[PDB]
Amino acid sequence: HHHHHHMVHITLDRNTANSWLIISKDRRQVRMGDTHQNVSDNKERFSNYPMVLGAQRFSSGKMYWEVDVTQKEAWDLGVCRDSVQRKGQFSLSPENGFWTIWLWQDSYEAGTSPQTTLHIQVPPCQIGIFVDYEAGVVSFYNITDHGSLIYTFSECVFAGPLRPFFNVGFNYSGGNAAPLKLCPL
Numbered sequence: 001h002h003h004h005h006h007m008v009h010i011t012l013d014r015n016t017a018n019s020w021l022i023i024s025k026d027r028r029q030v031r032m033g034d035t036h037q038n039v040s041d042n043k044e045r046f047s048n049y050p051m052v053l054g055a056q057r058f059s060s061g062k063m064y065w066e067v068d069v070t071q072k073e074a075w076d077l078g079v080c081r082d083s084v085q086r087k088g089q090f091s092l093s094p095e096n097g098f099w100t101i102w103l104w105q106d107s108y109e110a111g112t113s114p115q116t117t118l119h120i121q122v123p124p125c126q127i128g129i130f131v132d133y134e135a136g137v138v139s140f141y142n143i144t145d146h147g148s149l150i151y152t153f154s155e156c157v158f159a160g161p162l163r164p165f166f167n168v169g170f171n172y173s174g175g176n177a178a179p180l181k182l183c184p185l
């Protein structure tokens with residue numbers, strides 16, 4: 001792909017984070033803590049899952065960023081509406097305001113309803129995410145495999161400002177402690 005020139009500097013919004021997440025001082029890395037991280041509760045925090053939003057809001061244009069997923073067993077990445085539900089249980093789907101892919105139990109899937117099997121021959125260490133607001137497109141690229149396409153959501157009905165979306169996943173296994181990292185331009 002040739003989307004690299006739409007690169008945007010994404011930073012994480014502490015105030016949206018689940019209370020067990022640890023966000024680095026530069027706001028470019030997030031990982032699961034082994035306990036509550038001693039923050040006050042607020043209506044923005046994702047309560048049920050280890051999720052956090054980027055600070056940036058997009059309502060136009062073309063945007064591209066990259067995320068490092070090295071050695072993780074489970075994660076969700078993509079974009080979501082600024083107004084997605086924060087509390088209680090919910091599915092990641094466009095009907096609920098999410099445009100996401102994930103890794104879970106050694107398989108990759110796109111967050112459609114129902115979910116779609118992805119075909120990845122080279123497990124990615126870094127994922128590229130491309131958003132074209134006007135076109136209604138969210139695309140995912142395998143940086144480890146020369147930028148090969150993973151998945152395109154088209155005909156997207158964003159219906160609001162978009163925010164970068166992250167889930168570090170649970171760490172029940174002891175094999176999923178590694179962080180998500182926003183990679184340099």
Ligand SMILES: CCc1ncc(CNC)s1
Pocket residue numbers: 018019020032047048049050170171172
């Ligand atoms: C969603 C908040 C959490 N409660 C317990 C957690 C620890 N499990 C890996 S994370």
